[PDB]
Amino acid sequence: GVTSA
Amino acid sequence: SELSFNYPNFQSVEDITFQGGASPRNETLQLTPTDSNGIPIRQRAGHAVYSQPFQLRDTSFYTTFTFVIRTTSNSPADGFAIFIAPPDFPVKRYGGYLGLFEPNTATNTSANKVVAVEFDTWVNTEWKEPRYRHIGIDVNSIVSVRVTRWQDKDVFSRSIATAHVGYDGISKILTAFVTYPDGGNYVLSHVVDLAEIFPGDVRIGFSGATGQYETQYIHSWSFSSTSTN
Ligand SMILES: *[C@H]1O[C@H](CO)[C@H](O)[C@H](O)[C@H]1NC(C)=O
Numbered sequence: 001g002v003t004s005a
Numbered sequence: 006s007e008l009s010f011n012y013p014n015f016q017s018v019e020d021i022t023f024q025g026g027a028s029p030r031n032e033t034l035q036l037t038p039t040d041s042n043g044i045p046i047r048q049r050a051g052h053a054v055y056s057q058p059f060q061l062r063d064t065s066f067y068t069t070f071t072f073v074i075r076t077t078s079n080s081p082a083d084g085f086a087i088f089i090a091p092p093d094f095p096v097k098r099y100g101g102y103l104g105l106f107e108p109n110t111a112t113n114t115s116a117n118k119v120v121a122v123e124f125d126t127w128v129n130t131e132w133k134e135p136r137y138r139h140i141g142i143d144v145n146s147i148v149s150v151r152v153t154r155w156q157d158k159d160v161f162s163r164s165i166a167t168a169h170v171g172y173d174g175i176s177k178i179l180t181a182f183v184t185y186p187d188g189g190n191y192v193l194s195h196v197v198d199l200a201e202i203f204p205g206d207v208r209i210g211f212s213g214a215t216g217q218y219e220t221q222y223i224h225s226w227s228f229s230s231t232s233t234n
Pocket residue numbers: 002003004005082083099100101102127129131215216217
């Protein structure tokens with residue numbers, strides 16, 4: 001999954 | 006221009022510039038740092054580049070290196086890359102940017118000047134990469150213009166793997182062959198005019214980044230360029 005945006 | 010070098014191992018690290026979290030270790034290039042217990046440090050990037058610049062106008066090259074990925078659990082990140090960029094290129098963002106891009110601009114091809122062959126151990130949701138670990142060719146974007154599946158058997162094998170990267174200056178083609186002892190073989194090519202992207206100087210080297218649970222070690226490295234004349 002997304003982890004730093 | 007014409008340049009060649011050879012490191013059968015890295016017992017000497019004589020013309021290597023280290024930046025960020027990269028350092029020499031047990032006759033290798035360790036691209037990302039470890040703590041006092043040997044555990045990989047989260048969210049770091051490191052560069053090990055050959056310090057002498059060269060030019061790409063009217064030039065072909067061949068380079069080969071050996072490498073090991075060491076993982077300490079399931080979900081390692083983020084990988085490493087062999088890259089070409091200008092001589093003043095800084096270590097850029099850790100994580101899935103691989104030390105080669107900044108978040109703002111990482112997919113904008115007109116805001117970057119960097120070409121790489123990436124070994125990517127983490128599937129980034131943030132720019133919808135393909136759903137597997139992969140090897141790829143990057144041209145001014147963290148979104149690989151050409152990409153192929155990198156088998157997990159091989160990622161986690163802890164073998165000393167071999168990469169061959171070569172650029173034909175006449176046909177304007179960059180190509181990577183990657184091989185694993187009793188493992189997989191990988192082939193990628195892309196038409197790209199490196200002399201047009203890099204009209205001046207460049208340096209070649211390695212960028213690694215975490216991420217988590219991962220250390221990237223280069224064991225050997227040779228390079229030869231020659232003029233196409
Ligand atoms: C976010 O975290 C993971 C590790 O959990 C990876 O480092 C991934 O590449 C990171 N995201 C970005 C955008 O760097």
